[PDB]
Amino acid sequence: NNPLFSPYKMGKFNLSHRVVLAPMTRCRALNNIPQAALGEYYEQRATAGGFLITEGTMISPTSAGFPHVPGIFTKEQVREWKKIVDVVHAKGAVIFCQLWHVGRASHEVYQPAGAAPISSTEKPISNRWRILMPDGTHGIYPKPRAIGTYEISQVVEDYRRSALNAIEAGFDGIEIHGAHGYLIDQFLKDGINDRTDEYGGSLANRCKFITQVVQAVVSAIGADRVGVRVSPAIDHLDAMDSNPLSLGLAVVERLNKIQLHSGSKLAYLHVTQPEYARLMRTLRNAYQGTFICSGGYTRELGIEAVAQGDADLVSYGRLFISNPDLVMRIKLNAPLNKYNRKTFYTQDPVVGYTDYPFLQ
Ligand SMILES: Cc1cc2nc3c(=O)[nH]c(=O)nc-3n(C[C@H](O)[C@H](O)[C@H](O)COP(=O)(O)O)c2cc1C
């Protein structure tokens, strides 16, 4: 009947349905340590056979540009994440940790010793955009420091080590955040990447960083535990490309080759809808594997996406904020409850986080 409740084999993982929790930063992980509130939040949304992706999670002390986002680069963070993974696995769900480096989308207040954020480029995000500060005001993005290739290789090692830490905490896998104008996208997009070395210029060079990140995590934990998220067609944080479809296809070609070289498929490719329908289907058709679509989906649009072959899985963000039982509501076609944008990024462990009710 409802194709969202057709089972799906996501490689090693047997899913009972196709409704996915999209990664969402919520800023409840005080001092970058996962908290009991995150356990309650993910437990509420977990279902038997359902797939969850965490909020973006720091891979290193320089990787953050939001307040109170979790990390997975210290043993303390690993120990606390395990408690969260455990309550999600108790409900029979599958959960991946999203690994997130913001690059130049940061601020002195978020950096050790107030050092400059790192990027592909020395140019700041323009003041068309503002950063959320810890006090809830909006600040100015600073000038970043363009990193050399040794430092690039050390960032890759931060992804690799974080992927191993995620597996130690019990996560089923990880997702590489290569979207939305953050560090990887600062190398992908020719509206940002002004390098004249082997990581800039040509499509091949701009794709080197994501390829190396993905290959490192695949070697460390196995391709079937790795997902990759990208967003070729956007303007967020000035992340425009002159040819988004060609950039997306170049990325897809690199993922297909990583799979051929490794003898195994990635867990999935995850693409968010252009934000400033053909592009989505074109990347899906080009990719040898599982495709998760995201961005503006509703019950009806997700049913259509799976029914028409546009995606294998559909991820939902904002509707999962305010509907902890979103999966059940979609199954029953029960009315969905609104979300309160004001409390997307506040620190309260309950209000606007775990106090959205279930169906009566
Ligand atoms: C509050 C909030 C936080 C988000 N944080 C992340 C994040 O940490 N990583 C990421 O890749 N996307 C993040 N997103 C984007 C969502 O994963 C998702 O693509 C978007 O919400 C999908 O559209 P929808 O809300 O209409 O379902 C966030 C979105 C929202 C609204």
Residue numbers in the entry: 9 to 284, 302 to 385
Text from the published report:
Jasmonates are phytohormones that are pivotal in mediating plant responses to various biotic and abiotic stresses and regulating plant growth. The first crystal structure of OPR3 from tomato (SlOPR3) showed that the enzyme crystallized as a self-inhibitory dimer in which the L6 loop, a critical loop involved in substrate recognition and coenzyme binding, from each protomer intrudes into the active site cavity of the other protomer. Based on these observations, it was postulated that the formation of the self-inhibitory homodimer represents a mechanism for regulating OPR3 activity and, thereby, jasmonic acid biosynthesis.
However, our DLS results showed that at higher concentrations, the monomer–dimer equilibrium is clearly shifted toward the dimer. Structurally, it is unclear why R283E prefers to crystallize in its monomeric form while R283D prefers the dimeric form. Considering both the DLS and crystallographic data, it seems that the amino acid substitution R283E increases the flexibility of loop L6 in the corresponding variant, impeding proper dimer formation.
